[PDB]
Design a binder for this molecule. Structure first.
Ligand SMILES: *C/C=C1/C(=C/C2=NC(=C\c3[nH]c(/C=C4/NC(=O)C(C=C)=C4C)c(C)c3CCC(=O)O)/C(CCC(=O)O)=C2C)NC(=O)[C@H]1C
Ligand SMILES: *C/C=C1/C(=C/C2=NC(=C\c3[nH]c(/C=C4/NC(=O)C(C=C)=C4C)c(C)c3CCC(=O)O)/C(CCC(=O)O)=C2C)NC(=O)[C@H]1C
Ligand SMILES: [Cl-]
Ligand SMILES: [Cl-]
Lengths: 484, 493
C-alpha cells in the first residue's frame, strides 16, 4: 500500500488497473493470443466470458486483427473510429516488454491552435497566450504551464482559469510532488489523461501472470492513477486532467497542465490534435529560447566591447572600475553587484554589508582555481552568511587577478524575496487520510523550506556571460600593462 | 524589346506575357467576378467556346467551382488537386491573388497519392541524417529516385552569390557537374527574388511553344504580373542555356536557411517532363523539411566546431601556465593552431622571426604582410581572401597563399599568428570532364556550363575561400586566449 513514506518509489507503471473510460486487451508479441484483459472489456466490447486464452482473431475478428497487425508495422499507434458488430471504437495500439497492448474507447484543430502561437516572438508571449488558447479550445476549467527549475521544482509560469477559482500563478511546488517515475513517464508520453479522479479503477485480469510478471502500462493511456495523486486532486476539487509534456533540448522543460473540476476526457481525435500542438509548442519554445539566449550573450559582448574601448583611454583602471562597476549589473540578472579591489569595497543594490566582504573574498580565493566561482546557497559555503541571506543568498565572483584577491561580485536575494505570487493566502483545502501534505498550500510551504537561504541558481548562460566579463577584464588589465 | 546578354541582368521575367503549355491560366478581378485575361489554350484545355474576356467567372467555370475557389481564397498560392469542373472532368487548380488580380491555373488531373504520404516517405529517409554532408549527399539520390528526373543537383550559394554543385545524382551517361561552380551572374537578381518567393519553379519544356496571355497588356496599359503563377513562361536566355546543355525540363526546390536562399535542389530532365500537382505539393513539403533539418545540422556542426576550439585553447592555457618561456612554447606549438579552423597553412611571426607549417608565403614575404596588417588592424583579428588586392606583390605566391587571417599577439609589437588558404582553384574537387563541349545558339558560348565555369574561375582568380563568421569567432577566441596566456605570464614572471 502506497503512503507518504514510500510514494517516492511507487511503481506507478505497474498499478494493475486502468481508468474506466476505456478497456484494455494485452496480447503476446505476435498478437496471436489474449493474455490479459481489463474486467470491463465484456461490457464495452460486447464479449462474454474470460477472454484470456482466446485467440486475438476470436476476440477481435479477422478484419480487425488484420488491421491492427498492419498498424503494428508502423509512439503508440492512434486509430480513431475503427470498425469492430459494426460499432466504432478509437483504438490505441503499442508493443512494449514483448506485450501488445490494445486500448479501446467508444468513438483542423491542431492547425488552428498552432496558427495562434506561431507568431509569438518571445518566450513570455508564447507561454502567456498558450494557457488562454488551450483553455478556450480544449474546454478545461484551468490550464497552467509549469517550468521546471534546476532542482526539479515546478514554477507556475502561466495560468488561464474560471473567474471563481483561486490562482496558483507564481507559485512553486517541490520536486517531490512529482516522483521520478512520473517524470520518466511524462518524458516517454506526450499526453497524460485522467478522466475521473474519483472514478473506480478497473482491474487488469490477471494483475500478475502465471510467470509472476506484472503488466507494464508505461505507454498505456488508460493506466490508472496513484491513490496519492487522486487524493491530491480531490483535495483541490479537481476531478480530471490532461498534461501535454514540453520537451526542450531532449528533456522535460515543463508541462501544460489542464485541470477540470468535473470529469472530462477528450476524444482521441482531439487528443491527437493536442499532441501535435504540444510538439509545435515545444519546438517554437526552443527556438524562442535560443534567440533570447543569443540576444543576451550578444548584449553582454557589446557592453564589454564598449568597456574595452573605454578603458583604452584611461590611465587609471581601478578608478574607471570604481566609476563603472554598477553597469556590470546589466550583464546578467542580479540584485546587487560590487567591486572588491585592494581591500576596498564598492557596492550597488542588494549586497552583504561592508564588513562581510573580506570573508567572502577569502573563501573564493580558497575555492576558485582562477575562473568564475558561483553559488546560490551562500550559507552552505559560509555559515555566517545566513545573517544577510535576506539581502544576498547567492554570489557569483569574477576574479580580477591571479596574484591578488580582487573580485567583481554579483549577488542575488533569497528566492522567496523575489516571489510574485498571485494566489490567496486565505484559501484552505479539505484533506483526506494522508493529511495536509497533499494540498497546494502545503506543497508551496514545503518548496519555500527547500529554498530557504538560497537564491535563483546562476544559469549556464549567466556563467558564460561571467566568463566573457572575466576575459574582457583580463584584456583590459593586459593592454594597460602593455602601455603605461 | 528583346533580351540579350547585354540586358538579361534586368530582364522583366515576372511579366513575359506568356505561359508554358502544360496548363492554362485565367486572370480575374480581385473578387473573381469577371474574366479579364486568359491564355490562348484555355479554349482547348477546358473546352470553352468564344472569347472568355468580359464573361463572369460563374459563366465560364460554373457557380459551384467559383464558389469553391472563392472559399479557398479565404482560407502561398492555394494548390487544389482534383477539382471537378462544370463538364465533370477533374483539374488540378492553383489559385492566388496578387496586384489586385486573381490568377487561376489549371492542369488536367491524373491519379495521385495524398501529398502528405508521399512527403512523409521522403522525409523519413533524411530525418535520421546526422551531418550536413550525409543530408546533402543522400538528398539528390532520394529526390532523383522519388521524382524520376535524369539529374538532381544541390547548389549552395557562396558569399559572392556564386553557386557550387555540392551534390549530384545522374544517369550514368551524363557528364558530371559535381564540384563545379557557376558565377552569380548566371542567376539574375529577379530570378533570385522569384526563387525566394516561390518554393518551386517548373519548366515543362525548354523548347515548348509559349502560349500568349490575352491580352498581354490590358486597356489601362498594365502587363500581367505572373510572379506567383507556376505556368509563367521562361526567359529565352535560360531556354537557350538549357537547350545547349541538352536539358529539356526542370524543377527547382528553393532551400531557405535563416530566412534567405541557401541554395537550390535542381532537377533536370533531358526530355520534356512535368510532375503532377500532388507530387509537387509533396516536393514542397520535403523542401521545407530539408531546409529545417539542414539548419539544425548546420547549427550542431557550428556548435561542435566552436566548442572544439574552446577546449583546445583551454588546454593551451593550462599548458602555458607551467611554461617559463611562452615564445618557445608557441614556436613548438603553433602548428597545432591550424586545427582550430579550415586552413592550408599557419605560421608564427614573432620578433622578426618566421616559423611556418603547411602552405604559407615565402620567408621573405612575411615582413611586408606583417607591416600591412599592423597598419590595417586596430588590434583585432584582420583577414582577407584576396591578398593581392591588399598587397599587389602577393600575386606571385597566390597559388600557395591567396588568403590570410592574422591574429595579433601584442599591441606594442607587430607579432602575429597567421593563417593561410590557397587560391580556391587549387582546392577544386571537380568530378567533371574537361573534354565535354557544348553546342551553342545565337547568343554564343556564354550560355554553356563550360564557359560559366571559366567565368567563375576568373571571378575568384587570386582569391581564397572567404573566412566565415565561425572562422572569425574562433580566431577571436584564440586572440583573447593568447592575451590571457601573456597576462598570466606577466603576473607570475
Ligand atoms: C510521494 C508522491 C507524491 C505525489 C505523486 C504524484 N504526483 C503526480 C503528479 C502531479 N502532482 C502535482 C502536484 C502539485 N503540487 C501543487 O502545488 C499543485 C498545484 C498547485 C499540484 C497539482 C503536479 C503538478 C503533478 C503533475 C500533473 C498535473 O499538474 O496535473 C503523480 C502522477 C499521477 C499520474 O498521472 O499518474 C504522482 C504519482 N504527489 C505528491 O504530492 C507527493 C506526496
Ligand atoms: C543575364 C542572364 C542570364 C541567365 C538567366 C537566367 N538563369 C536562370 C536560371 C539558372 N541558370 C543557371 C545556370 C547554370 N550555370 C551552370 O554552370 C549550370 C550548370 C552546370 C547552370 C544550370 C542555373 C543553375 C539556374 C537555376 C535553375 C536551375 O539550375 O535549373 C533564370 C531563371 C529561369 C526561370 O526559371 O524562369 C534566368 C532568367 N542565365 C545566364 O547564364 C545569364 C547570361
Ligand atoms: Cl507501493
Ligand atoms: Cl525558458
Amino acid at each position: 500500500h502506497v503512503d507518504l513514506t514510500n510514494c517516492d518509489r511507487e511503481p506507478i507503471h505497474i498499478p494493475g488497473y486502468i481508468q474506466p473510460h476505456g478497456c484494455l486487451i494485452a496480447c503476446d508479441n505476435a498478437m496471436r493470443m489474449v493474455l490479459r484483459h481489463s474486467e470491463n472489456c465484456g461490457e464495452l466490447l460486447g464479449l462474454e466470458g474470460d477472454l484470456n486464452g482466446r485467440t486475438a482473431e476470436d476476440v477481435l475478428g479477422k478484419k480487425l486483427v488484420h488491421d491492427l497487425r498492419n498498424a503494428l508495422t508502423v509512439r503508440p499507434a492512434m486509430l480513431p473510429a475503427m470498425e469492430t458488430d459494426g460499432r466504432s471504437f478509437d483504438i490505441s495500439l503499442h508493443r512494449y516488454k514483448s506485450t501488445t497492448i490494445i486500448e479501446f474507447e467508444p468513438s483542423g484543430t491542431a492547425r488552428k491552435m498552432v496558427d495562434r502561437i506561431r507568431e509569438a516572438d518571445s518566450v513570455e508571449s508564447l507561454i502567456s497566450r498558450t494557457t488562454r488558447l488551450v483553455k478556450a479550445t480544449l474546454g478545461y476549467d484551468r490550464v497552467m504551464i509549469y517550468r521546471f527549475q534546476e532542482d526539479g521544482a515546478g514554477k507556475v509560469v502561466s495560468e488561464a482559469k474560471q473567474p471563481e477559482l483561486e490562482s496558483f500563478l507564481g507559485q512553486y511546488f517541490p520536486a517531490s510532488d512529482i516522483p521520478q517515475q512520473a517524470r520518466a513517464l511524462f518524458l516517454k508520453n506526450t499526453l497524460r489523461i485522467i478522466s475521473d479522479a474519483s472514478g473506480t479503477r478497473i482491474p487488469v485480469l490477471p494483475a500478475v501472470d502465471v510467470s509472476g510478471e506484472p503488466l507494464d502500462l508505461s505507454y498505456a493511456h488508460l493506466r490508472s492513477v496513484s491513490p496519492i495523486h487522486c487524493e491530491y486532486l480531490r483535495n483541490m476539487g479537481v476531478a480530471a486532467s490532461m498534461s501535454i509534456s514540453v520537451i526542450v533540448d531532449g528533456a522535460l522543460w515543463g508541462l501544460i497542465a489542464c485541470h477540470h473540476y468535473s470529469p472530462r476526457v477528450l476524444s482521441m481525435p482531439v487528443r491527437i490534435a493536442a499532441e501535435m500542438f504540444g510538439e509545435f509548442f515545444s519546438m517554437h519554445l526552443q527556438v524562442l529560447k535560443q534567440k533570447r539566449r543569443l540576444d543576451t550573450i550578444n548584449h553582454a559582448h557589446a557592453a564589454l566591447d564598449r568597456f574595452l574601448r573605454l578603458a583604452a583611454h584611461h590611465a587609471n583602471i581601478e578608478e574607471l572600475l570604481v566609476d563603472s562597476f554598477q553597469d556590470f549589473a546589466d550583464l546578467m540578472p542580479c540584485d546587487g553587484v560590487g567591486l572588491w579591489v585592494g581591500n576596498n569595497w564598492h557596492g550597488h543594490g542588494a549586497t552583504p554589508p561592508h564588513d562581510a566582504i573580506p570573508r567572502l573574498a577569502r573563501f573564493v580565493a580558497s575555492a576558485s582555481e582562477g575562473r568564475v566561482w558561483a553559488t546560490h546557497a551562500l550559507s552552505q559555503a559560509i555559515p555566517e552568511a545566513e545573517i544577510y541571506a535576506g539581502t544576498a543568498a547567492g554570489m557569483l565572483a569574477i576574479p580580477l587577478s591571479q596574484v591578488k584577491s580582487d573580485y567583481l561580485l554579483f549577488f542575488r536575494k533569497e528566492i522567496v524575496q523575489n516571489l510574485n505570487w498571485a494566489g490567496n493566502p486565505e484559501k484552505s483545502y479539505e484533506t483526506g487520510p494522508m493529511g495536509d501534505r497533499l494540498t497546494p498550500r502545503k506543497s508551496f510551504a514545503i518548496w519555500k523550506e527547500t529554498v530557504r537561504l538560497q537564491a535563483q541558481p546562476w544559469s549556464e548562460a549567466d556563467r558564460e556571460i561571467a566568463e566573457a566579463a572575466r576575459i574582457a577584464l583580463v584584456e583590459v588589465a593586459f593592454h594597460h600593462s602593455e602601455h603605461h
